[PDB]
Amino acid sequence: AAQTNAPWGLARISSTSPGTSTYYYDESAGQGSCVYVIDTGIEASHPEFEGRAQMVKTYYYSSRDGNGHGTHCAGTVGSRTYGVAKKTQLFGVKVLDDNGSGQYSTIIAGMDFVASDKNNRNCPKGVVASLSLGGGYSSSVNSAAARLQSSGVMVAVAAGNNNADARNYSPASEPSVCTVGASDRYDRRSSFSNYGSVLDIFGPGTDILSTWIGGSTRSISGTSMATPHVAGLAAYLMTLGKTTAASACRYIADTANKGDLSNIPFGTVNLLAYNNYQA
Ligand SMILES: NC(=O)CN(CC(=O)O)CC(=O)O
Ligand SMILES: [Ca+2]
């Protein structure tokens, strides 16, 4: 399949060079996979989600995305126009409030929730969890992300936006999950992207068009926007049978575009998420 005039990030994950405009992907599109977006929520009524989105859990007085961040991230995963995996099932877990904050205790409870809840859902191609959140180093936060991954979910987490080594942030610094840095449409490391040996992979993270609350759309930037590209890619590859939850981060790094990014520090991987799709 081909999406003409796609958001640059989508075009970028289907090309070996920057600057293209069509997103080419296999039509299976993540069908039969499931991606838990653990964030401020998902506006599942947005027409872009085509009924494929639902809230399954909130830790606040409402399950509504009053912020927009989780709806944006969910749209990069699996919206019809802005998503990598256009036929994936999306589940919202609201661990962040409408200002975008959440206590680590809440975030950890959300991760243990998903490890259990996936057992009450039909996800025959497998389960991914996208975590565009984090704060300072926490061994308990890292532990929770490791359990989620060990339970059989492909965990993708934001490297963070501190232009610093991700070793000092969580869940970015948990080695067993997939830690995602951000790039821009000229193949530079994004100005704010964290870096470090613990990064697994980069995805598109500067100026990313996606869904927004109130049935709308907007462009925003962050390792939060790169993470759902990687989460969607894993869903897509899992549906295609080319990888499993346990091995997907490795597979994506194995098959990445290599050495394309500029301003990558010594000791950080120069790998950009790539779907190797051949019409
Ligand atoms: N979402 C991100 O990675 C960074 N951004 C994105 C945004 O929310 O507009 C700022 C923030 O989170 O404060
Ligand atoms: Ca890792």
From Swiss-Prot:
Active site annotation, chain numbering: 39 (charge relay system), 69 (charge relay system), 224 (charge relay system)
Which parts of the sequence bind Ca(2+) 2?
16, 260
- Which molecular-function annotations from GO does this UniProt entry contain? metal ion binding; serine-type endopeptidase activity
GO CC term (a single one): extracellular region
> Which GO biological process entries does UniProt record here?
proteolysis
Q: Which reaction does it catalyse?
A: Hydrolysis of keratin, and of other proteins with subtilisin-like specificity. Hydrolyzes peptide amides
Q: Which residues bind Ca(2+) 1?
A: 175, 177, 200
Peptidase S8 domain sequence ranges: 7-279
Family according to the record: Belongs to the peptidase S8 family.
Role description: Hydrolyzes keratin at aromatic and hydrophobic residues.
> How is this protein named in the record?
Proteinase K
Species per Swiss-Prot/TrEMBL record: Parengyodontium album (Tritirachium album)
Report where the shown chain sits in the full-length sequence: first residue, last residue, total length: 106 to 384 of 384
